[PDB]
Design a protein around this ligand. Structure first.
Ligand SMILES: Nc1nc2c(ncn2[C@@H]2O[C@H](COP(=O)(O)OP(=O)(O)NP(=O)(O)O)[C@@H](O)[C@H]2O)c(=O)[nH]1
Ligand SMILES: NS(=O)(=O)c1ccc(Oc2ccc(F)c(Cl)c2)cc1
Ligand SMILES: [Mg+2]
Ligand code: NA
Lengths: 469, 167, 166
């Protein structure tokens, strides 16, 4: 038979499941809704582990439970009373014999030890992967240190001592490939001559590689704490979502730089060379699975100042028109082909983050925090699972590093790119559009001619890599 | 077969803009949503006895990708320009959104509606007369909507479709 | 995208977590933090087909030995890991093999035998002994180093191929 449990009056997590405290979805069960007590019971369940649930819960719980209250609840979960001796044990003791204690030993082995270990696994995951709760609340950290540091008894000792060390390391806090990265490529600008770096003088292969390293690092830095609760859209977004905002602002700045390079090249022949070079960079982004970079280019070419430059488009080689069109097709129909391509490639990749942001925001806005059942309010956990499925997908693409060598000077050049200067956004984007009108006036105004601005060769070195011995 | 209208929702972030399309497309009568579901932004409707398909683009949450706005906007035939009635800045943003739509579509007469969205019980700061006056100065309809009761939501989208049909 | 549920099992300290983190992050973990249960996901193209690996990293410490049925039920394939400088961990392999067969009620469970820490010179389990055991199980034997990456992709992706052909 099943093990008997402590009285629910002394141990709250032994209350029977009912539709008044837990609802399952239609081979472990999936929870649709429940009280916080029932969620924590199933988070630390004696019959099975649920590592996905641990991640989901620790990512999203702050929408329904404060960190301080969560710690209190899992400490309460940990402190399980042992059953009293049974009749057979009593009779043995009355005869001076050692009791078999069969029911007690089974309850220790099959209830207490698994639940306690799974509580410690919640603590371990909390400290390792959601440490911001403790960075933001020193007293929460003190409570966790005290709890872990006072767990007695040999069954948990190895994990207690380990978690104590992990906490201490997190308080004061390397990649291997089997292949070598490819050689850094140079064009007109030579190593160390940062003053000559520009769109046409750096090698287009190396522009794409260094932007991909930069954009990959920005992508990998975004933590779920910047996303849950839609906090990047709220008044404190600069406080709560700084890595996400830095990533987006890089993407915006690069798109605007591409537009600026195009419309400030007033000579038609030179501007064709500029656009052709940007499409070559897009080709290398595609080869590297840098989808953020692909869409940076697509966004620039579809901007109002660039899209209208029909005389430039007419002189772009057909094969490059096709590259740009196929890249743009990724975004059509609500990113249908992008989503399929992302799910088919071999990482490393750099996803486009915007789709994740829209899906997290709409999941949060479009589902209720609670479900009302039998007069009770239950936490709508299905909603949190949906959010954590998105943050889990984000994290899966954050694991794989690029096998590309950093070039510190090219990296610094793109880190310091500032196409807007001191201008405000409207002033700058109006400037770009007025340049577009200058260099290719609206019909029937005639097309003017403009002098060349580049003193160096416009011919691209191409985007196939070279390999000396 | 039936006409498909490509509608685009634009407006300031962080003030409940997404509730407009969610409430439209939703199971009207179950408060639930999975935006990842292929065609959670397509809805077949009957407007003035004529059946059509609405395809709605709402990039809510991507407002910081400001250089993508032109590309997103160019996909649309009609636009809902949304502000929050308790956020004066979002109302003041409307002028620049409309100017950007006109530039992207290369037209001075783009089908659009002005939508004032009530996203919570915080105090209203934009009076309906102010928004009516703005809409009249642009020659476009004004619809007010609730983010919680679905009031006005159908009117906003159907009015926009009528603006497209009568363009 | 087909999804594959892989489970990494074996005695405490043999390098299950280091192997998994090397595969997932290309990083070698120097610390020995005993696992309770961890899970990882990896999208990867194997033999031209994209799939999604769900990798369960399990506890080797004996104090967790009563909690294994629950993860053996869900797993589709098992990496059975020992360390080539730890003969007791090699002798522990058959206990995992027999428990997996019992729980899944099957003589034909996808499995790969993994001899880890092959970067270390001081070997105490000879390759021949491990290969003989693998042949008796009908499974491949792959020596790995979580430190250098030697054999790591081979071990995990061979297990995927076994599940695919099951
Ligand atoms: N030299 C060397 N050390 C390794 C290798 N793999 C793991 N180690 C080391 O061995 C120790 C234990 O590794 P770990 O991955 O934690 O082992 P585990 O099998 O996951 N232990 P547990 O069952 O307790 O979770 C660590 O110090 C780790 O750095 C390897 O291939 N080479
Ligand atoms: N939708 S799209 O991405 O296929 C696309 C984007 C922009 C387009 O207009 C161009 C203008 C100047 C140019 F130099 C070039 Cl190359 C293109 C045409 C199509
Ligand atoms: Mg481990
Ligand atoms: Na206001």
């Amino acid at each position: 038979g099943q093990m008997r449990l402590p009285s629910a009056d002394v141990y709250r997590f032994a209350e029977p499941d009912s539709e008044e405290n837990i609802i399952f979805e239609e081979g472990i069960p999936i929870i649709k809704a429940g009280t916080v007590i029932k969620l924590i019971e199933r988070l630390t369940y004696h019959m099975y582990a649920d590592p996905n649930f641990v991640r989901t819960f620790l990512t999203t719980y702050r929408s329904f439970c404060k960190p301080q209250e969560l710690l209190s609840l899992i400490i309460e979960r940990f402190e399980i009373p042992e059953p009293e001796p049974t009749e057979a044990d009593r009779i043995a003791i009355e005869n001076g014999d050692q009791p078999l204690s069969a029911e007690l030993k089974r309850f220790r082995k099959e209830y207490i030890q698994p639940v306690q270990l799974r509580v410690l696994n919640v603590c371990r995951h909390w400290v390792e992967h959601h440490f911001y709760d403790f960075e933001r609340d020193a007293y929460l950290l003190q409570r966790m240190e005290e709890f872990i540091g006072t767990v007695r008894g040999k069954a948990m000792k190895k994990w207690v001592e380990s978690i104590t060390k992990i906490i201490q390391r997190k308080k004061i806090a390397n990649i291997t490939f089997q292949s070598s990265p490819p050689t850094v490529e140079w064009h007109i600008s030579r190593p160390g001559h940062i003053e000559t770096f520009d769109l046409l003088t750096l090698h287009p292969i190396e522009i794409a590689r260094q932007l991909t390293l930069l954009e990959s690092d920005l992508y990998r830095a975004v933590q779920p704490s910047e996303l849950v609760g839609s906090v990047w859209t709220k008044e404190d977004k600069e406080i709560n979502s700084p890595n996400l905002l830095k990533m987006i602002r890089h993407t915006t700045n690069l798109t605007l730089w591409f537009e600026k390079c195009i419309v400030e090249t007033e000579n038609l022949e030179e501007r064709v060379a500029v656009v052709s070079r940007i499409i070559e960079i897009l080709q290398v982004f595609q080869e590297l699975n840098n989808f953020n970079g692909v869409l940076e280019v697509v966004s620039a070419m579809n901007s109002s100042p660039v899209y209208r430059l029909d005389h430039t488009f007419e002189q772009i080689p057909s094969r490059q028109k096709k590259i740009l069109e196929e890249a743009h097709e990724l975004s059509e129909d609500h990113y249908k082909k992008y989503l399929a391509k992302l799910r088919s490639i071999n990482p490393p990749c750099v996803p486009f983050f915007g789709i994740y942001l829209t899906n997290i925001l709409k999941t949060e806005e479009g589902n209720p925090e609670v479900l009302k059942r039998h007069g009770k309010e239950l936490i709508n956990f299905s909603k949190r699972r949906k959010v954590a499925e998105i943050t889990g997908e984000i994290q899966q693409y954050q694991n794989q590093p690029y096998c590309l060598r950093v070039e510190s000077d090219i990296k610094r050049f793109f880190e310091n790119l500032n196409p807007m200067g001191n201008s405000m956004e409207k002033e700058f984007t109006d400037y770009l559009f007025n340049k577009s009108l200058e260099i290719e006036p609206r019909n029937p105004k005639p097309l003017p001619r403009f002098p060349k601005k580049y003193s160096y060769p416009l011919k691209s070195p191409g985007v196939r890599p070279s390999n000396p011995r | 077969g039936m006409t498909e209208y490509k509608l685009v929702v634009v407006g300031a972030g962080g003030v409940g803009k997404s509730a407009l399309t969610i409430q439209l497309i939703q199971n009207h009568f179950v408060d639930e949503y999975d935006p990842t579901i292929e065609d959670s932004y397509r809805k077949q409707v009957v407007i003035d006895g004529e059946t059509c398909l609405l395809d709605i683009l709402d990039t809510a949450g991507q407002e910081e990708y400001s250089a993508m706005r032109d590309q997103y906007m160019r996909t649309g035939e009609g636009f809902l320009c949304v502000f929050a009635i308790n956020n004066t800045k979002s109302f003041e943003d409307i002028h620049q959104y409309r100017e950007q739509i006109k530039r992207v579509k290369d037209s001075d007469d783009v089908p659009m509606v002005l939508v004032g969205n009530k996203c919570d019980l915080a105090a209203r700061t934009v009076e309906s007369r102010q928004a009516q006056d703005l809409a009249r100065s642009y020659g476009i309809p004004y619809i007010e909507t609730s983010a919680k009761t679905r009031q006005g939501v159908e009117d906003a989208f159907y009015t926009l479709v009528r603006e497209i049909r009568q363009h």
